[PDB]
Amino acid sequence: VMVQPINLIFRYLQNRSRIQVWLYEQVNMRIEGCIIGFDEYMNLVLDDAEEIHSKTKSRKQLGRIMLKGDNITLLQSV
């Protein structure tokens, strides 16, 4: 419990790095975006967000979205 998970998040917010979110209920689609805001539930507001569909190597542009935190399995930088 040295590194705090929210510290990564504040870091992403601060840095505007592009992140990718693996989702809880489905494995064939991930979300990517830049974090501009969040809350204590890890609900995230993402700018320039996209669905990434691995099987077809395709993407869908979403613009600005609020992603519900209970869908987040894993958050990584890309």
């Binding site: 419990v1 705090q4 489905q26």
Partner: protein
């Protein structure tokens, strides 16, 4: 304190949806969200991808075991 004994240890994590990653546990909070460093995604293909330092949410972890 349960996860404390796993700090700085290489772990294998089974995640919901048949997903599997391995990495070093660097941190956690009261909700068992984890920070895993040097994270490697083990693709169903058998390929391993380096995904870096990640946050994993506690509810998505099905199974956790140390590789050390």
């Amino acid at each position: 304190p349960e996860l404390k004994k796993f700090m700085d240890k290489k772990l294998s994590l089974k995640l919901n949806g048949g997903r599997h990653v391995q990495g070093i546990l660097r941190g956690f909070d009261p909700f068992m969200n984890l920070v895993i460093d040097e994270c490697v995604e083990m693709a169903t293909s058998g390929q391993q991808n380096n995904i870096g330092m990640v946050v994993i949410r506690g509810n998505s972890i099905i199974m956790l075991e140390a590789l050390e």
